[PDB]
Amino acid sequence: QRPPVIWIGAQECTGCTESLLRATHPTVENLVLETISLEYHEVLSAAFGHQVEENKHNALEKYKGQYVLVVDGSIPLKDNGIYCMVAGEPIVDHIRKAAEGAAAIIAIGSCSAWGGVAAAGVNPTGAVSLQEVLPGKTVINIPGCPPNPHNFLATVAHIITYGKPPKLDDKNRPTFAYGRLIHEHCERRPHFDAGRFAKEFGDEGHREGWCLYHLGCKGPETYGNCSTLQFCDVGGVWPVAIGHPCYGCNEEGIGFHKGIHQLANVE
């Protein structure tokens, strides 16, 4: 028997699910066949409509107290929740019901972790975070837009393998992935230190792999593991390594708030 997981998408772009299709340890096929039982996920479920609704209810009863609940996307509270309606009911209600019986609750992605892009600017739909919708519950936050999928998978594995969540910071983010500023573990720090800065994409310094601070890099104010774990498990692939500043997508008040080329505050 494999540990049950219930995944509900709110105001999601599906990028957080799509992260799983890049994963290698486990791959998505090994995740769903070997590591977990994915009891509800609308992107992959064979069942639709009334049949998939049955699966949800069956799973909530059968696995009460045992399942991991995962939510991607923000939860819109404006106008009584009507900005995201599934089977005729506000998504906030589906989420609160599923949270009642959850052994652990995970907000995957910046949207569910802190509102993200969906809650930015004038916030048209009154989008909020999963934690805000579940004030009485401990929500594990795995931010990023989307996070490296292993930030999520290794959190789930810790719960399964050792019976408890990984250590968390004071935003309930796992320390193994979010315990340090990108700029406090970035391979271009020597260039920063020496005043060796890209000024425009395609200039000489940029073409020598210099620091991207003056292009608006938000590494100095963003917690994450983008410089170390990086992305896609091919080696050497993260925004800065490719030539673009960090935008702060992990970090509330940075990504989707500050302009790309706006300079970060350095501690």
């Binding site: 494999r2 957080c16 890049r22 769903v32 064979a46 600017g121 048209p124 739909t125 425009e200 994409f201």
Partner: protein, 551 residues
């Protein structure tokens, strides 16, 4: 007669509700409804034009890359910027590799379980299954031994009593027509597909900096620093790595996906006679290869009343005929302003009043082209290519038809492509032709770098007064995408996205005309109204993306 609701529609991107009236076991009328809105157009407003792409990319994570690219193209359109050719090669490789991933995942992970019964696969003889593909495919992973491994995984899943994503599927449904052996073949291919799509996205990641959500674009070109002799930048070693993944895509695409497309058609020939959504089709040209945002590798055009012979070519993203035709209405949508709006003058003012069969029933707007309803996406794209007399497209379609003929003794005519299966075929053809796009553009990049051109970025200037309008067109996996940006006093004063799934999924329009999803369902036989598999088959053929449709 009776009224049914399918909510949620699964195995799509996003939140979709489909309603159907059924009369004498056949759908008589349908409603398509996008049930979630974010207001991404409003979120991006009032910002610097350069910042838009990183925000509006988050319209969709399935069709990641596409909104980013459309956004920078829109800004470049407004500002009159000619993108460096190297930046085009890189943009093109990303889009082609992304779309490869996208299409493979759609056929297998999203669509196959409409046509494939995993329970029946347990009864298959693996050796017979392998034998069925002799002279049909040269794929190296169709052995009885492969099929046995796959069958045992299904056996173990079922035995565990935890079906998960497979629970309460349409196993045994009367519309399921594959023999046990072909069901097993499909499940094996479903699992193999996951490796191929992973390789496609390794291409994307090495140029984009990650996927989902690339981070290598700019208004003015790309952030990739081309330097063959540079440490930490885009050098020959990194390019060689990209190439190693490009080369891993073709065999699966050609020997599995393309073949399975013909196989499904062969067993489900009635699905060539239903699921027609429109008589008009639009696609834009794609993959520009010159220094002036043109010279596209793929052609675009407009087909009216299904007449390929008199289609109108579109060879430029600045084509005023294309630009001037496009409007959207919110008469049957949950927005305030209902009259058709050109997107430079568009509004997106929420006005939710609940569902009404005759009133507003969707967060999706209703696009028209010169007042007509239009289907976009791979069917449109293939038909336009056939109308253009594109030899590569006719040849690739012919290969699929040749397999179908081998299996059934029958041929396919163009008239039969205006269907659920025709749509699926168009997507497959696209995936196949994109492998040549990748080879072509990798070679172009290597050659151009060799001539001494390492330019990737032209820094924009944005006048602090004046009003400038720009449109960024892109032929996305699900069809023609357009981002419409108005700049006034240096900032975005209006932003409107008109997205392919908006065209196809949009509700009844200003004249109460029916859009493609709604039209395609009329006449769908439904054996069991409690389990309307036949409806979902047709809807899935359009590859719905509702985060896209609504934004």
């Amino acid at each position: 007669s009776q009224r049914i609701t399918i909510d949620p529609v699964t195995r799509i991107e996003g939140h979709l509700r489909i309603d159907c009236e059924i009369e004498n076991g056949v759908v008589s009328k349908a409603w398509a409804s996008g049930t979630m809105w974010r207001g991404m157009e409003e979120i991006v407003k009032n910002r610097d034009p350069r910042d838009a792409w990183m925000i509006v990319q988050r319209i969709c994570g399935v069709c990641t890359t596409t909104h980013a690219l459309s956004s920078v193209r829109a800004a470049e359109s407004a500002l009159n910027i000619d993108v460096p050719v190297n930046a085009q090669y890189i943009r093109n490789i990303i889009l082609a590799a992304h779309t490869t991933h996208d299409h493979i995942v759609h056929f297998y992970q999203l669509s196959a379980l409409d046509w494939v019964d995993i329970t029946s696969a347990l009864q298959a003889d693996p050796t017979k299954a392998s034998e069925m593909l002799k002279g049909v495919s040269t794929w190296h992973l169709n052995s009885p031994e492969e099929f046995t491994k796959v069958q045992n995984k299904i056996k173990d899943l079922v035995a565990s009593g935890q079906l998960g994503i497979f629970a309460n599927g349409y196993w045994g449904h009367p519309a399921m027509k594959l023999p046990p052996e072909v069901n097993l073949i499909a499940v094996a291919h479903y699992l193999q597909a996951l490796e191929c799509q992973r390789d496609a996205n390794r291409v994307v990641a090495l140029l984009g900096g990650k996927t989902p959500h690339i981070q290598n674009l700019a208004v003015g070109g790309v952030a990739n620093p081309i330097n063959l002799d540079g440490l930490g930048v885009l050098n020959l070693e990194r390019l060689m790595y990209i190439k190693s993944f490009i080369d891993k895509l073709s065999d699966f695409v050609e020997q599995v996906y393309k073949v399975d497309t013909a196989v499904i058609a062969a067993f489900y020939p009635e699905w060539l006679t239903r699921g027609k959504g429109a008589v008009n089709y639009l696609s834009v040209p794609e993959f520009p290869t010159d220094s002036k945002n043109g010279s596209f590798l793929f052609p675009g055009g407009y087909i009216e009343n299904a007449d390929l012979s008199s289609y109108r070519p579109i060879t430029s993203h600045s084509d005023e005929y294309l630009i001037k035709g496009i409007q959207e209405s919110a008469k049957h949508s949950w927005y305030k302003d209902e009259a058709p709006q050109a997107p430079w003058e568009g509004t997106t003012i929420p006005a939710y009043d609940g569902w009404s069969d005759d009133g507003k029933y969707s967060w999706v707007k209703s696009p028209t082209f010169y007042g007509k309803t239009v289907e976009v996406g791979p069917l449109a794209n293939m038909l336009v290519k056939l109308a253009a007399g594109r030899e590569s497209t006719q040849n690739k379609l012919n290969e699929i038809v040749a397999i179908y003929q081998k299996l059934t003794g029958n041929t396919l005519e163009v008239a039969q492509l205006h269907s659920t299966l025709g749509r699926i075929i168009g997507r497959t053809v696209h995936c196949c032709e994109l492998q040549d796009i990748l080879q072509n553009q990798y070679s172009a990049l290597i050659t151009n770098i060799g001539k001494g051109d390492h330019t990737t970025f032209v820094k924009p200037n944005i006048p602090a007064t004046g009003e400038f309008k720009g449109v960024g067109f892109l032929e996305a996996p699900r069809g023609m995408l357009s981002h419409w940006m108005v700049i006034k006093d240096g900032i975005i004063s209006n932003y409107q996205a008109v997205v392919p799934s908006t065209w196809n999924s949009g509700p009844r329009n200003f004249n109460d005309d029916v859009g493609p999803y709604e039209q395609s369902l009329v006449g769908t036989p439904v054996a069991d109204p409690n389990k309307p598999l036949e409806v979902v088959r047709t809807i899935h053929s359009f590859d719905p993306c509702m985060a896209c449709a609504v934004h």
